[PDB]
Nucleic acid binder design. Structure first.
Ligand code: ZN
Ligand code: ZN
Ligand code: ZN
Length: 798
RNA sequence: UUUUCCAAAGGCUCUUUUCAGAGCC
């Protein structure tokens, strides 16, 4: 009848050792698996981002708080139990750093036997008894989708029952993304709510980030560089500290008068470096002398989303914002093909750049003859050289300035270096936040060029005065602003090629300009409005470069992802009916590694531009299961564990295996910078960092030199030897986003010399693509398990 | 078997002096 005080929100099962109370949500939940693959309590914890667990009053342990004996951390995802060697008393300790920093140092305690408290997405039976299957089915049954809906209702209001899910029927679902449109106003009305939802979600998830009572080195700078170094106390474990964001520094202490300054991040965590560094744009009134009792806060900004909305409305209301043909093509309207009447250069090669192959030459000649061209660039095909050829030819056409944009600043830097290699005059536009960022192409930045602009000397005098003092008078500031605007306008008109980011093209300084040529790059990594921001500038000839098989843009809002916002402009153009021209040759992999992904994801179209003897590293005496094939799959029988964040995964057994193979690789003579570690899960990456940094069997700096990153963090990077840990291994659950073929594509194509795959074939074989992976690897007879020294071919079949 | 937990990004505002003016980073 009436639910007791300790009753599950989802089902209401009442039992002493079956209900767990959450301090964050002030609700009880059952440990029963239910219809879904996960327990109710674990599902509530992961969905509601809670990290506090309170045991029921009656049970094997009674009213207990699961706190680490060393540090007392509340986050249950880090605690683990150790059975005593003398009695049955269990020791609850954090995985790290409490394993080595434990004050108890009990003889019966050992950290090797340590296991996570959460297993198979549910609490262990001895702690919380799993409800009996018959009782857990005879009671009220709730499915996953309505569970998520009820959790959302609880989040938006802490009063919601089962009847609140059906009787109201809120709906208000965002309009789904269409493939074919009819009006620009329709496009704006459809994509406005999605952008607004994304911005709101980002603001909500990023505004709740602050720290208090931190130290600061507080070093100074000659040219007004208030540079502050401080380290996050790692209690919040927030990685949102990023280049270009805004940080407000508040000094509420009594040592100095209260100060509230604004600055930008200049240095994020690095290899063994940490000590995040920020640059303050405020005056000299900052409390330099004080170090402690410093408060910091991150405030979200809406510049990017405002730029997307402005571009959308400009496209909706301005007929000349884009060419008519491009406007009709983007809306899916069926129109006849148009051939651009451009003069074809006799030689397709670029001065100062390597000669293109036949496929690249054909791609260039086809692109130059079409107002709209789509290029599918497989990994390792030298797409940068191709794009350099395109910009070279476009500038040689003399049809005004040529705009280049890319979602990532690294891609922009690579492309601008490539074009500058031809000797062409290029101007790189950087944001104010990125002005202090040091880059190899920073000498080509707009602000640095202005600082080196010697035709007008009073501008330099004002600049150095600003560098040596604070803000000048109002008239002086107005004159300086006018001089800067005039100089940058002259530079931009004089410049032949302007390169920046896709969002950065929305800068007012770049505004009020018309460009007849745009070569949006890496578009497969950007949301459709992000790619659409630069084109409303007056595009007439428009080129996309990217690979849908590589990866897609990352969207955080669940509703936006469901509505189709994750789709890139490249994908929509491809599915519209435009066949993208794809480069057929590449020089990045030894043929053995490149044979499989070409066969699978590129229907056997890629060609190996390098030979086997070319892609062998000298002084590398490492044994292989097949001497001709420098890759293999190592089989591990580990169990996945929930990461500290509560939504990622890790595995200790695979981490130890990775450590062993990396130690062997360094013993083989491979340079430490060549060894890369790739994991799709952030929690696994952090655990590997902790395991390889603090506990180093070999030289600690030796392990330090290698670097670990997420899939798309490493995607823009190319190295010799790569070792992958797929992490996920669950009998009753899925692999997660590992079923996405794009991540498999980038993971297999990230190498140059060798790939070492580590994972559990039994769990991965359920997904058909990974089953094909396993079948191919067994056909090559490189599935190996057991001792590293004594390699044995696995007998498992899939 | 849910949908997955994964990067990158990045200064303007106010006022009817609005054909404009004012102030901030
Ligand atoms: Zn329940
Ligand atoms: Zn909760
Ligand atoms: Zn602890």
């Amino acid at each position: 009848k009436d639910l007791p005080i300790h009753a599950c929100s989802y089902c209401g099962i009442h039992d002493p050792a079956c209900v767990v109370y959450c301090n964050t949500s002030k609700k009880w939940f059952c440990n029963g698996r239910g219809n879904t693959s996960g327990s109710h309590i674990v599902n509530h914890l992961v969905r509601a981002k809670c990290k506090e667990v309170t045991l029921h009053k009656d049970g094997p342990l009674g009213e207990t708080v699961l706190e680490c004996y060393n540090c007392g951390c509340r986050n249950v995802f880090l605690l683990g139990f150790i059975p005593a060697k003398a009695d049955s008393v269990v020791v609850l300790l954090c995985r790290q750093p409490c394993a080595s920093q434990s004050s108890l140092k009990d003889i019966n305690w050992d950290s090797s036997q340590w296991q996570p408290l959460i297993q198979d997405r549910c609490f262990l039976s001895w702690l919380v008894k799993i409800p009996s299957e018959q009782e857990q089915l005879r009671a009220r049954q709730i499915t996953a989708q309505q569970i998520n809906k009820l959790e959302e209702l609880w989040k938006e209001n802490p009063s919601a029952t089962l009847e609140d899910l059906e009787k109201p029927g809120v709906d208000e679902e965002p309009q789904h993304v269409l493939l074919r449109y009819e009006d620009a106003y329709q496009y704006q009305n459809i994509f406005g709510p999605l952008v607004k939802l994304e911005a709101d979600y980002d603001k909500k998830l990023k505004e709740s980030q602050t720290q208090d009572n931190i130290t600061v080195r507080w070093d100074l700078g000659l040219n007004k560089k208030r540079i502050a170094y401080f380290t996050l106390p790692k209690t919040d474990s927030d990685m949102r500290l990023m280049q270009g964001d805004e940080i407000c520094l508040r000094y509420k202490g009594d040592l100095a008068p209260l100060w509230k300054g604004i600055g930008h991040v200049i240095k994020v965590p690095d290899n063994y470096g940490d000590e995040i560094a920020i640059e303050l744009r405020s005056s000299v009134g900052a409390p330099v002398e004080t170090v402690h009792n410093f408060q910091v806060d991150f405030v979200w900004k809406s510049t990017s989303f405002d730029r997307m909305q402005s571009a959308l409305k400009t496209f909706a209301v301005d007929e000349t914002s884009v060419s008519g043909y491009i406007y009709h093509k983007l809306l899916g309207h069926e129109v006849e093909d148009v051939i651009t009447k451009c003069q074809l250069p006799k030689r397709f090669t670029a001065q100062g750049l390597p000669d293109l192959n036949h496929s690249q030459v054909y791609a260039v000649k086809t692109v130059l003859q079409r107002p709209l061209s789509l290029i599918q660039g497989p990994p390792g095909t030298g797409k940068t050289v191709t794009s350099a050829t395109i910009v070279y030819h476009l500038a040689r056409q003399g049809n005004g300035p040529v705009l280049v944009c890319a979602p990532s600043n690294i891609a922009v830097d690579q492309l601008t270096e490539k074009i500058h290699q031809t000797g062409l005059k290029v101007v790189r536009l950087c944001a104010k936040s990125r002005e202090a960022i040091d880059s190899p192409v920073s000498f080509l930045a707009l602000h640095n060029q202005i600082r080196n602009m010697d035709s007008m000397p009073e501008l330099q005098k004002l600049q150095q005065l600003k560098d040596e003092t604070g803000e000048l008078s109002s008239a002086d500031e107005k004159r300086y602003r006018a001089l800067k605007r005039t100089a940058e306008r002259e530079l931009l008109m004089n410049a032949d090629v302007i390169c920046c980011t896709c969002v950065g093209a929305g800068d007012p300084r770049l505004a009020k300009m018309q460009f007849r040529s745009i070569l949006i790059d890496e578009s497969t990594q950007a949301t459709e409005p992000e790619c659409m921001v630069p084109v409303v500038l007056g595009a007439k000839q428009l080129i996309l470069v990217g690979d849908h098989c590589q990866l897609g843009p990352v969207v955080m809002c669940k509703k936006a992802a469901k509505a189709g916002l994750s789709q890139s402009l490249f994908e929509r153009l491809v599915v519209l009916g435009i066949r993208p021209i794809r480069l057929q040759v590449q020089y990045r992999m030894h043929p053995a590694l490149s044979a499989f992904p070409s066969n699978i994801f590129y229907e056997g179209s890629l060609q190996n531009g390098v030979t086997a003897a070319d892609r062998v590293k000298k002084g590398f005496d490492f044994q292989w299961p097949q001497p001709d094939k420098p890759m293999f799959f190592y089989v591990t029988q580990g169990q996945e564990e929930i990461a500290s964040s509560g939504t990622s995964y890790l595995n200790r057994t695979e981490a130890a295996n990775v450590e062993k193979i990396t130690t062997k690789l360094l013993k083989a003579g491979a340079k430490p910078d060549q060894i890369g570690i790739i994991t799709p899960y952030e929690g696994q990456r952090s655990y590997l960092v902790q395991y390889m940094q603090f506990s180093g069997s070999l030289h600690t700096k030796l392990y330090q030199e290698v670097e670990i990153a997420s899939v798309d963090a490493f995607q823009g990077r190319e190295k010799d030897f790569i070792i992958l840990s797929c992490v996920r291994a669950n009998e009753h659950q899925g692999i997660g986003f590992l079923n996405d073929p794009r991540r498999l594509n980038v993971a297999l194509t990230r190498a140059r010399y060798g790939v070492i795959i580590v994972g559990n074939p039994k769990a991965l074989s359920k997904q058909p693509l990974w089953n094909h992976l396993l079948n191919y690897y067994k056909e090559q007879k490189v599935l190996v398990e057991g001792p590293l020294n004594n390699l044995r071919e696995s007998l498992m079949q899939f």
